[PDB]
Each structure stands twice: as structure tokens, then as C-alpha cells.
Amino acid sequence: VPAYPFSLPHALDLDPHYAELRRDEPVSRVRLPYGEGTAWLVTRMSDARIVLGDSRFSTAAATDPATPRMFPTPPEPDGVLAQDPPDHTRLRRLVGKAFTARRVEEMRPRVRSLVDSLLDDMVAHGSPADLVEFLAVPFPVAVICELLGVPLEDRDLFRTFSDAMLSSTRLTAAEIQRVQQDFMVYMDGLVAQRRDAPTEDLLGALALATDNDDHLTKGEIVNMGVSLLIAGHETSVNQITNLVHLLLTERKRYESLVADPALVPAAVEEMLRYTPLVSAGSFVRVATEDVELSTVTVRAGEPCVVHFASANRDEEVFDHADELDFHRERNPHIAFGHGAHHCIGAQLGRLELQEALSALVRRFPTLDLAEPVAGLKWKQGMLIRGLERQIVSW
Ligand code: HEM
Ligand SMILES: Clc1ccccc1C(c1ccccc1)(c1ccccc1)n1ccnc1
């Protein structure tokens, strides 16, 4: 019956029907914009974890044009998220051997160098300043560049490919393609150079990854680096604005970090739990067998959407579920998903948000929102919520 996106997003606010569903119909039929039939909407954490972390669901099945979806275009099946276990598993493994926790934590001194530079320019420009232009946009692209080992001299041209994607950019017809193909050249050229001569960075290590005699192709290393640049940029950008937004606008939260900057990591986790960043939820899962859920049981062709943000507000698992508690002891959120398709960039994402917040706290203990909240330029966040602008004073 009900059309799925129940509403267009206001701010970081949740449509009130997810909570109602969470108590009354945790698993609920809905009709998504496109594709055919209906889908199971999964609102709570228990069911979410089953659906997201059970071998009995497929994401490759949902590349079928007659599967319910959000965009008119269906999904290409060679995309990571759409890939199913045997191959996906091979994939996660190989990049796994390069996108390691160690490499990501070893970014930290460098990444902290970049944030402090960016904030230096913000101080140079004076006392009100658009946090989006000075911090949120450049910071994620610069971090990815550094991780890929994009050579220092032509990152500015990485900056234009990246933010020539974002929710809107040049709008110059579809010759955003003449942006794709000459950049696609670049990556291929770069991937080739490091395959011959590897370096301390993702590409160099994607070049060397192995798994009992198994390889990544020049082609596979291109599709990942790009897939990673796309994914990481617009999300990280928006999330930066979302956290700042939550911290100011209640502004005792920000104070609580100034007073105690050691709380930044716990705060970020808690803020990841709370922010409904992903507005329509996760990539579509299509049950391959019969999986029993909380209240219904799902049969073999029916698709489900897991809504992460509602799972993250499930009052069965989080006390004071709809409040920000930076001192919460237990926080089993799935802001980064779960199971096989758990976010590949989860740690780099935590790195970004830790260093950003901690920098703003050291350097700008007087930070404050410098426009009225009611008027804030929220993106039309069908996919990803975030702010188009964020003026702040100090
Ligand atoms: C605020 C930061 C981030 C959040 C909240 C986030 C959230 C998520 C979520 C929820 C998924 C799973 C989708 C599903 O199961 O249907 C996911 C997957 C993914 N994320 Fe992120 N993500 C973030 C940052 C990043 C970054 C920085 C990158 C890359 C540098 C990235 C790349 C990916 C990729 C490649 C996948 C697919 C993994 C797979 O299918 O095996 N994400 N992310
Ligand atoms: Cl953020 C999100 C939620 C659900 C599905 C996909 C994505 C998103 C992504 C990642 C890899 C492949 C396709 C989409 C995504 C990419 C681009 C625009 C919106 C969402 N993602 C970004 C970071 N982590 C997950």
C-alpha cells in the first residue's frame, strides 16, 4: 500500500512513521518509486542484522530491472554493493589486504596536518566563514587523494572530477562525460605506473594484494579507486556538516567536547548512530530462501529494504533512543551497515570525523552557527542528507 519514501526529509528529522512501525509493524509492505511489486521495509535492529548479515539474501538479484528501486536507472551489476558472495568475497578479501585498519590509522598524522591547514585558511578569511566551502568539501577529497597517493602536482584536477559529481556542479549537459573519460584515462595510467612500481598507499597495495595466487586486474583496481572516490566524497562531506549541525544547535554538546576533547571519538560514534544520513535505506536485499524475521517470514523472491537510521533508534536496544548521549556505554549502531557489505571506508570515515571535530574543538572553542536554523540550506536529501552551506562564527 504505502509509497515508500513517506516524505522528503526535513533537516535531520525522522519521519514519525518509522517509530510507529518499529512498535506496530516492524516489517511492513511498501511500494518503491520504480521497479515492480512491493518490498519489505525493515525498521528494527534485530531484523536489520538478520537481513544485512545472512547468506540467504542477495544484492545481485536486485540488479534485475523488475526489482523495486529508487532511481529510474537500475544498478550496474559489476558495482561492489550489487556483487554476491563468491565474487564479492574474493573482492573484499583482496582490497581487504590493502584497505587495512593499519593503513587507515597511519593516515592520522597526515590527515590532521590537512585539517589544520584548511582551518588555517578559514582563520585567514576572517570571523564568519562557510564551513562547507572551507572544511567539508575540500577535506574528504584531499584525504582520499592522500590515501590513493595521488601525486602532489595534479590533485586540483582530482578536486574537479570529485566535486564535478556532487549533487550539482557544472550541470553542463551530460559532457560531465568528457570529465569522466579523461580522468578515467588518468587512473588507468596511474594504476599501470604503480603496478610496475608500487608505493606506500592504497594503489601500490591494491597492486600487490594476493590471496593464494589471486590477482587484482588493472581494471579491477581502477573500478575500486573510482568507486571509492565517488562513495567517500559526498557522504563524508555531508556527514561533516551533519555532526557540526548537531553540536551547535544544542551547543552544550559542543561545550562538552571543549571541556573534554577525549570524548570526541565516543561522540562521533553516537552522532553516527543518530544522524539519518542515508535517507531511503540500504541497497535492496532479495531473500533467496525462507528467512524468519521478527514478525513475518520472508520468502524467496521478495525484496527488503533495511532502514539503518530506524534500526539505530530502536528503543529495544538503546536506552534514551532519541537523544544524543555522548556517554552512552553500549552503542551497537549500524550506521556503516553490517554483514558482507559493511562499509569498506568505515575507518577512514571515523578518521575524518575524529580529526575534523577534534581540530574544530582545539582551534575554535568559540565556534557557533552564524545563520538561523530555520533557514538552513538542506540538500534535497532523497539519498544522502547534508547542508549546501554552513556559516559559522568564532
Ligand atoms: C560517513 C561516512 C560513511 C557512512 C555513514 C557510510 C555508510 C555505508 C553503508 C551504510 C554501507 C552499506 C550499504 C548497504 O549495506 O546497503 C556502506 C557501504 C560502502 N561504503 Fe560507505 N559509508 C561511509 C563512508 C565511506 C567512505 C569514506 C567510503 C570510501 C572511501 C565508502 C565506501 C563504501 C563502499 C565501497 C561500500 C560498499 C562495500 C561493499 O558492498 O562491500 N563509504 N557505507
Ligand atoms: Cl551511503 C550509501 C547507502 C546505501 C547504498 C550505497 C551508498 C553509498 C554507496 C557506496 C558504494 C556504492 C554505491 C553507493 C553512496 C554512494 C554515492 C552516493 C550516495 C550513496 N555509500 C557512500 C559511502 N558509503 C556508501
- The answer to whether 294 is a known catalytic residue is no
CATH number at residue 147: 1.10.630.10
Please state the atom number of ligand 2 nearest to the C-alpha of residue 384.
19
- The answer to whether 236 is a known catalytic residue is yes
Please state the atom number of ligand 2 nearest to the C-alpha of residue 232.
23
125 among the known binding-site residues? Answer: no
159 among the known binding-site residues? Answer: no
Query: How far apart, in whole angstroms, are the C-alpha atoms of residue 194 and residue 32?
Result: 43
Q: How many CB atoms lie within 10 A of CB 125?
A: 11
Q: Is 230 in the pocket of ligand 2 (CB under 6 A)?
A: yes
Expressed in angstroms and rounded, the spacing between residue 231 Cα and the centre of ligand 1 is 7
Q: Is 335 in the pocket of ligand 1 (CB under 6 A)?
A: yes
Query: How far apart, in whole angstroms, are the C-alpha atoms of residue 28 and residue 40?
Result: 5
Q: How many CB atoms lie within 10 A of CB 63?
A: 20
- The answer to whether 146 is a known catalytic residue is no
Q: Is 282 in the pocket of ligand 2 (CB under 6 A)?
A: yes
**Owning domain of residue 240:** 1-394
How is residue 103 written as a grid cell?
A: 593503513
Expressed in angstroms and rounded, the spacing between residue 384 Cα and the centre of ligand 2 is 9
| Residue of 32, 81, 169, 342 to mutate, ligand 2, most atoms within 8 A of C-beta | 81
What is the stated resolution of the deposited model, in angstroms? 2.7
| CA 363 and chain centroid, separation | 26
Query: How far apart, in whole angstroms, are the C-alpha atoms of residue 329 and residue 318?
Result: 10
Q: What are phi and psi of 58, to 5 degrees?
A: -120, 145
SS (H, E, C) the chain: CCECCCCCCCCCCCCCHHHHHHHHCCEEEEECCECCCCEEEECCHHHHHHHHCCCCEECCHHHCCCCCECCCCCCCCCCHHHCCHHHHHHHHHHHHCCCCHHHHHHCHHHHHHHHHHHHHHHHHCCCEEEHHHHHHCHHHHHHHHHHHCCCHHHCHHHHHHHCCCCCCCCCCCCCCHHHHHHHHHHHHHHHHHHHHCCCCCHHHHHHHCCCCCCCCCHHHHHHHHHHHHHHHHHHHHHHHHHHHHHHCCCCCHHHHHHHCHHHHHHHHHHHHHHCCCECCCCCCEEECCCEECCCCEECCCCEEEECHHHHCCCCCCCCCCCCCCCCCCCCCCCCCCCHHHCCCCHHHHHHHHHHHHHHHHHHCCCCEECCCHHHCCECCCCCECCECCCEEEC
Helices 177-196 and 218-247, axial angle in degrees (round to 10): 120
Q: 298, 291 in Cβ contact below 8 A? A: yes
Q: 390, 178 in Cβ contact below 8 A? A: no
- The answer to whether 292 is a known catalytic residue is no
Query: How far apart, in whole angstroms, are the C-alpha atoms of residue 322 and residue 333?
Result: 13
Number of domains in the chain: 1
Q: Residue 297: name the closest of 71, 13, 97, 42 by CA.
A: 42
Q: Is 273 in the pocket of ligand 1 (CB under 6 A)?
A: no
Annotated active-site residue in 231, 266, 321, 346: 231
Expressed in angstroms and rounded, the spacing between residue 282 Cα and the centre of ligand 1 is 10
Expressed in angstroms and rounded, the spacing between residue 123 Cα and the centre of ligand 1 is 32
Q: Residue 61: name the closest of 83, 29, 80, 35 by CA.
A: 83
- The letter for the amino acid at 329 is E
The long-range contacts involving 180-183, CB below 8 angstroms and separated by at least 24 positions, are 183/157
Q: Is 356 in the pocket of ligand 1 (CB under 6 A)?
A: no
Please state the atom number of ligand 2 nearest to the C-alpha of residue 282.
4
Expressed in angstroms and rounded, the spacing between residue 235 Cα and the centre of ligand 2 is 8
Q: Is 394 in the pocket of ligand 1 (CB under 6 A)?
A: no
Query: How far apart, in whole angstroms, are the C-alpha atoms of residue 62 and residue 82?
Result: 7
Q: 110, 146 in Cβ contact below 8 A? A: yes
- The answer to whether 352 is a known catalytic residue is yes
Q: Is 81 in the pocket of ligand 2 (CB under 6 A)?
A: yes
Query: How far apart, in whole angstroms, are the C-alpha atoms of residue 345 and residue 333?
Result: 16
Annotated active-site residue in 352, 356, 358, 359: 352
